[PDB]
Amino acid sequence: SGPVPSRARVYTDVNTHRPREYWDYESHVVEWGNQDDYQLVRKLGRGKYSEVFEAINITNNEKVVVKILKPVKKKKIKREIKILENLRGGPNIITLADIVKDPVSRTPALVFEHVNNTDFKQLYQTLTDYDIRFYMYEILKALDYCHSMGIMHRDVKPHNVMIDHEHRKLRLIDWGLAEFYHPGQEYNVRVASRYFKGPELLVDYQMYDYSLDMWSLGCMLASMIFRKEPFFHGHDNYDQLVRIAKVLGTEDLYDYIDKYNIELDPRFNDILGRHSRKRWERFVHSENQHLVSPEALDFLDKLLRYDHQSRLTAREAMEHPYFYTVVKDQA
Ligand SMILES: COc1ccc(/C=C2\Oc3cc(OCC(=O)O)ccc3C2=O)cc1OC
């Protein structure tokens, strides 16, 4: 009894009709920049594969960000950077300003736009129903962009969404987990933050597509409109599924497991329990009411769907009344 195969409902063969050079990042030959152009000012964060610095461009005195890369894997390095390059110029997509060959490592460093990030600590008490809509929309553009460009981001979460609230500047960052979609292809499930994991990952189902990202985003929206960070708060990957099944409910879950002949580790049976589908009304109170609206609950209700093929696409989400008001464009 095997798992039923899946295709992207949209943008399936985007890489399929692109020249090999576009998606074969292995054969990509990088052209490095001048590491002496840049001086590191402060450390701004560190993961467990990299270290992020505030930096300076000494030819012009501009602020940048410098991602130095602990000696990981040539394959992994060139992916992020082929992708970063494939998407440069797109909406709200962080600009890769430079690439540099680095001493610190026997590996290198990437140089990005500075985004003077309003901290999500005094952002979360200034933001308005309109603000979130605006920002949801801008991130959607980024996610439609890169999806249309044959690419899943795989690590959507509020830290990878820098926002300079003062200029209304949103860029989407951290494409180190990002990967090309090829239909038919089984992928790593160990991507994305726990809280932002799609059910297809939590259920070890690998033939996922872009709509993973719509899940993550979808949790984000939940978060912001409900003033709860993270919305789904589990203590490991098992717990997380429980924390989802307590609002989405066990029925539709087990039907999702049913459609894709996905077979679940037996231990999951006893923790998973039996839960009903809660109304999205149930999480509206007095502190978060002013951000919650029928358009929203409904918008949201179309992203958090077990069945990956069910989730709204980026295109459709941007075409949702929730976003109508959003200041509609031109010269
Ligand atoms: C609230 O504290 C801050 C935290 C982060 C920033 C700015 C930035 O942090 C980044 C991390 C980045 O990671 C690059 C990557 O991991 O892909 C890229 C750009 C920025 C970036 O512009 C600015 C901040 O204000 C001092």
Curated annotation (Swiss-Prot):
<dbReference type="GO" id="GO:0006974">
    <property type="term" value="P:DNA damage response"/>
</dbReference>
<keyword id="KW-0131">Cell cycle</keyword>
<dbReference type="GO" id="GO:0045732">
    <property type="term" value="P:positive regulation of protein catabolic process"/>
</dbReference>
<dbReference type="GO" id="GO:0032435">
    <property type="term" value="P:negative regulation of proteasomal ubiquitin-dependent protein catabolic process"/>
</dbReference>
<keyword id="KW-0597">Phosphoprotein</keyword>
<dbReference type="GO" id="GO:0006915">
    <property type="term" value="P:apoptotic process"/>
</dbReference>
<keyword id="KW-0808">Transferase</keyword>
<dbReference type="GO" id="GO:0005956">
    <property type="term" value="C:protein kinase CK2 complex"/>
</dbReference>
<dbReference type="GO" id="GO:0007165">
    <property type="term" value="P:signal transduction"/>
</dbReference>
<comment type="subunit">
    <text>Heterotetramer composed of two catalytic subunits (alpha chain and/or alpha' chain) and two regulatory subunits (beta chains). The tetramer can exist as a combination of 2 alpha/2 beta, 2 alpha'/2 beta or 1 alpha/1 alpha'/2 beta subunits. Also part of a CK2-SPT16-SSRP1 complex composed of SSRP1, SUPT16H, CSNK2A1, CSNK2A2 and CSNK2B, which forms following UV irradiation. Interacts with RNPS1. Interacts with SNAI1. Interacts with PML (isoform PML-12). Interacts with CCAR2. Interacts with HIRIP3.</text>
</comment>
<dbReference type="GO" id="GO:0004674">
    <property type="term" value="F:protein serine/threonine kinase activity"/>
</dbReference>
<dbReference type="GO" id="GO:0075342">
    <property type="term" value="P:symbiont-mediated disruption of host cell PML body"/>
</dbReference>
<comment type="function">
    <text>Catalytic subunit of a constitutively active serine/threonine-protein kinase complex that phosphorylates a large number of substrates containing acidic residues C-terminal to the phosphorylated serine or threonine. Regulates numerous cellular processes, such as cell cycle progression, apoptosis and transcription, as well as viral infection. May act as a regulatory node which integrates and coordinates numerous signals leading to an appropriate cellular response.</text>
</comment>
<feature type="region of interest" description="Interaction with beta subunit">
    <location>
        <begin position="35"/>
        <end position="40"/>
    </location>
</feature>
<keyword id="KW-0090">Biological rhythms</keyword>
<dbReference type="GO" id="GO:2000042">
    <property type="term" value="P:negative regulation of double-strand break repair via homologous recombination"/>
</dbReference>
<keyword id="KW-0804">Transcription</keyword>
<dbReference type="GO" id="GO:0005886">
    <property type="term" value="C:plasma membrane"/>
</dbReference>
<dbReference type="GO" id="GO:0070822">
    <property type="term" value="C:Sin3-type complex"/>
</dbReference>
<dbReference type="GO" id="GO:0050821">
    <property type="term" value="P:protein stabilization"/>
</dbReference>
<dbReference type="GO" id="GO:0042802">
    <property type="term" value="F:identical protein binding"/>
</dbReference>
<dbReference type="GO" id="GO:0061077">
    <property type="term" value="P:chaperone-mediated protein folding"/>
</dbReference>
<dbReference type="GO" id="GO:1905818">
    <property type="term" value="P:regulation of chromosome separation"/>
</dbReference>
<dbReference type="GO" id="GO:0016301">
    <property type="term" value="F:kinase activity"/>
</dbReference>
<keyword id="KW-0418">Kinase</keyword>
<dbReference type="GO" id="GO:0005654">
    <property type="term" value="C:nucleoplasm"/>
</dbReference>
<dbReference type="GO" id="GO:0017148">
    <property type="term" value="P:negative regulation of translation"/>
</dbReference>
<protein>
    <recommendedName>
        <fullName>Casein kinase II subunit alpha</fullName>
        <ecNumber>2.7.11.1</ecNumber>
    </recommendedName>
</protein>
<keyword id="KW-0053">Apoptosis</keyword>
<dbReference type="GO" id="GO:0106310">
    <property type="term" value="F:protein serine kinase activity"/>
</dbReference>
<dbReference type="GO" id="GO:0008284">
    <property type="term" value="P:positive regulation of cell population proliferation"/>
</dbReference>
<keyword id="KW-0805">Transcription regulation</keyword>
<feature type="domain" description="Protein kinase">
    <location>
        <begin position="38"/>
        <end position="323"/>
    </location>
</feature>
<keyword id="KW-0225">Disease variant</keyword>
<dbReference type="GO" id="GO:0051726">
    <property type="term" value="P:regulation of cell cycle"/>
</dbReference>
<dbReference type="GO" id="GO:0051879">
    <property type="term" value="F:Hsp90 protein binding"/>
</dbReference>
<feature type="active site" description="Proton acceptor">
    <location>
        <position position="155"/>
    </location>
</feature>
<dbReference type="GO" id="GO:0005634">
    <property type="term" value="C:nucleus"/>
</dbReference>
<feature type="binding site">
    <location>
        <begin position="44"/>
        <end position="52"/>
    </location>
    <ligand>
        <name>ATP</name>
    </ligand>
</feature>
<keyword id="KW-0067">ATP-binding</keyword>
<comment type="similarity">
    <text>Belongs to the protein kinase superfamily. Ser/Thr protein kinase family. CK2 subfamily.</text>
</comment>
<dbReference type="GO" id="GO:1905337">
    <property type="term" value="P:positive regulation of aggrephagy"/>
</dbReference>
